[PDB]
Amino acid sequence: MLTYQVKQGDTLNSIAADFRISTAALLQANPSLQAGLTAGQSIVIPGLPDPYTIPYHIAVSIGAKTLTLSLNNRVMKTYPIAVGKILTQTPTGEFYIINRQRNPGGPFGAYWLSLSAAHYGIHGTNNPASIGKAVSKGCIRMHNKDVIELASIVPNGTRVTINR
Amino acid sequence: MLTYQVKQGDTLNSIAADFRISTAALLQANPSLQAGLTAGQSIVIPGLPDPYTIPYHIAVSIGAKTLTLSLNNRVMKTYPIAVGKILTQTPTGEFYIINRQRNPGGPFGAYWLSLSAAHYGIHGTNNPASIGKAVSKGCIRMHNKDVIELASIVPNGTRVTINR
């Protein structure tokens, strides 16, 4: 039920990477007319619910270094985060939670949550002193306790809006 | 039934102007908790349904200069549009159709549909050449026949998502 407006300069492969699925399996499969990329038209992304049915909404502020979880347009919890360096920034715009994996370990800490930009996610950390700072390669980092909490709550498909 | 998360710096008048309602009524009358407005809280906007009960969804691509109308996440109609000039751009994000006026005339042509940002709408045109171009003060323009058709189908409250 998740529908994605293919933007200009999207290829089929960059869309499949962003959403962590294959170019065939449904991408072409879910969308039959995929017979030439079409900027401004809409395709479905097979594994995910319609994100407007998920009453959760995550809002990231790069400047304030906060991630805020809302439920039905009321903020519920706000957490401190690390964000990307000035030369390796966290990207702005509209994303979704795609995937998760518990206890990846290393610099990814207690949890990974994929965002709908290839190679980007929200994750924990084994460098807790880094939270609150512009320090990362582009991912949003959280104290382990908070990412565990966030992952416990939000389903795949949840909207993540990132602003400066 | 339509809810809204109060943003930092929202005032009663600023919210009222975006949703084309008055300050007292409907706005204080609906949220009685408005003896003080607080960032992060939920208020209801009177005069409009929950957008999730409307099975239509409009998606606008600024780059591609298209407006798509979908029903239960299948595309029904695709239209060419004019959009804002590069110094007077059509804003991005989530809006709603608030209200409408048939045959406003002048540069607004056959129909005006208010969006949920003050002074922005989707409308027709008496300058048909403008369609498909980045030429507007910020509104989305359509051919008169197309805005008539769009209006004939989608109700007030319909989600309008605008992407670059």
* Furthest C-alpha separation in chain B: 49
Exposed, middle or buried, A72 (CB in 10 Å: 0-12/13-18/19+)?
exposed
3-state secondary structure of B121: strand
Contact in structure between B84 and B138 (CB atoms under 8 Å): yes
Q: Which helix (H) or strand (E) holds B160?
A: strand B159-163
Q: Say which DSSP state B148 is in.
A: H
Q: Which residues contact A129 (CB under 8 A, 6 or more apart)?
A: none
Kindly determine whether residue A40 and residue B52, on different chains, have CB atoms separated by under 8 Å: no
Which positions of A are annotated as active-site residues?
A: 123, 139
Residues of chain A in Cβ contact (below 8 Å) with chain B: 1, 3, 5, 7-8, 39-42, 44, 50, 52-53, 57, 68, 70, 72-75, 94
Per CB-CB distance under 8 Å, the chain A contacts of B40 are 68, 70, 74-75
Residue B136 C-alpha, separation from nearest chain A C-alpha, in angstroms: 19
User: What would you report as the CA-atom Rg of chain A, rounded to the nearest whole angstrom?
Assistant: 16
Considering only CB atoms, A7 lies closest to which of B40, B51, B63, namely: B63
Cis peptide before A12 (omega within 30 of 0): no
Beta-bridge mates of residue B97: B115
CA B92 to the chain's CA centroid: 11
Type of residue found at A7 = K
Resolution (A): 2.0
Reported as type and span, the H/E element at residue B144 is helix B144-153
Q: Positive or negative, the Cα torsion across A146, A147, A153, A158?
A: positive
Angle subtended at Cα A13 by Cα A12 and Cα A18, rounded to the nearest 5 degrees: 100
Facing residue for A5 by CB, picked from B4, B59, B65: B59
Which 8-state DSSP code applies to residue B129? Answer: G
Alpha-carbon distance of A16 to A30, in angstroms, equals: 12
d(CA B74, CA A161): 24
Contact yes or no for A7 and B163 at CB 8 A = yes
The answer to whether the Cα torsion of B99, A4, A19, A87 is positive or negative is: negative
Q: Calculate the alpha carbon distances from B48 to A21, A161, B115, B157 in Å.
A: 37, 24, 12, 6
How many C-alpha atoms does A23 have within 13 Å on its Cβ side?
9
> Chain-centre distance of CA A161, in angstroms?
9
State the SS3 of chain A. CEEEECCCCCCHHHHHHHCCCCHHHHHHCCCCCCCCCCECEEEEECCCCCHHHCCEEEEEECCCCEEEEEECCEEEEEEECEEEECCECCCCEEEEEEEEEECCCHHHCCEEEEECCCCCEEECCCCHHHCCCEEECCCEECCHHHHHHHHHHCCCCCEEEEEC
> Which among A143, A155, A122 has a CA at the least distance from the CA of A56?
A155
Q: Which of B5, B37, B38 to mutate to test the interface with A (most CBs of A within 10 A)?
A: B5
Cα angle, residue A89 at apex, residues A86 and A92 outer, rounded to 5°:
130
In the PDB record, what is the listed experimental method? X-ray
Determine which helix (DSSP H) or strand (DSSP E) holds B12, and give its type and residue range. helix B12-18
Chain A nearest C-alpha distance from B83 (Å) = 14
What are the percentages of helix, strand and coil residues in chain B, rounded to 5?
15, 40, 45
Alpha carbon distances (Å) from B37 to A57, A161, B15:
21, 23, 11
Of B142, B145, B144, B134, give the one whose Cα is nearest residue B160. Answer: B142
Query: In the structure encoding, which two tokens stand for residue B55, read together?
Result: 């099975």
Intra-chain end-to-end CA distance of chain A, in Å: 29
Pairing type for strands B93-102 and B111-115 reads antiparallel
Closest residue in chain A to residue B77, using alpha carbons only: A41
Look at residues B152, B147, B93 and name the one whose alpha carbon lies nearest to residue B117: B93
Longest CA span, chain A = 49
Q: Rounded CA gap, B75 and A43, in Å?
A: 9
Angle at A144 between CA A138 and CA A147, to 5 degrees: 70
- Chain position carrying tokens 């006026």: B101
Cβ contact B41–A3 (<8 Å): no
Domains plus CATH for chain B?
A: 2-47 (3.10.350.10), 48-164 (2.40.440.10)
